[PDB]
């Protein structure tokens, strides 16, 4: 079935965010089977779900990007029917669909800010190409459902999308992400 937008996170001085639900469980299941989603889209970050899992998608330069381990090869439910992936890069764990019209695109970009599923903004320190550390460690449960979420620079430009957390005893210390560069490498 399709990936279905079930909510959104709208981003803002310092970086703030809030979440808004747009779909319920049943409408999620049905929209997944039809691929037809007639709802208005808003914001830079979409909350997305299949019938078995949910996660995040980030709009960067007119492409709505997420993790392959969340979305697999699936279409995104859209106003004219299902939307085929424009990019499908399995080795990078990256996929993208053309961004639906109303979505707000971020533009590409070392103190970074991770935006979680609950619309908390948490400081991250870049530690190389595709890894960052959490400046204030939190339980990994606090990051549940945030895969595909954006890593921002202080001006709110996009640095990458969040992929996995490195954990010790249930505490997340580091985040693994897909760099905005890998989106550019993918795009050509």
């Amino acid at each position: 079935g399709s990936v279905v937008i079930v909510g959104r996170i709208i981003l803002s001085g310092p970086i703030t965010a809030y979440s808004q639900q747009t779909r319920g469980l049943l409408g999620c299941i049905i929209t997944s089977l039809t691929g037809r989603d007639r709802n208005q889209v808003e914001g830079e970050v979409q909350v997305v779900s299949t019938a078995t899992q949910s996660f995040l998608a980030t709009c960067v330069n007119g492409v709505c990007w997420t993790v392959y381990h969340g979305a697999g090869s699936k279409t995104l439910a859209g106003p004219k029917g299902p939307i085929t992936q424009m990019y499908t890069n399995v080795d990078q764990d990256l996929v993208g669909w053309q961004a639906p019209p109303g979505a707000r695109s971020l533009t590409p970009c070392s103190d970074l800010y991770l935006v979680t599923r609950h619309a908390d903004v948490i400081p991250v320190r870049r530690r190389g190409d595709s890894r960052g550390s959490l400046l204030s460690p939190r339980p990994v449960s606090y990051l549940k459902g945030s895969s595909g979420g954006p890593l921002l620079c202080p001006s709110g430009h996009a640095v990458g999308i969040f992929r996995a957390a490195v954990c010790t005893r249930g505490v997340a210390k580091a985040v693994d992400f897909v760099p905005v560069e890998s989106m550019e490498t993918t795009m050509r």
């Binding site: 949910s54 490195v166 693994d176």
Partner: peptide
């Protein structure tokens, strides 16, 4: 250490027991 993927259950607010 442990490398964790961060998918949740289906829907906007996934149900837990």
């Amino acid at each position: 250490d442990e490398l964790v993927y961060l998918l949740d259950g289906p829907g906007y607010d996934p149900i837990h027991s």
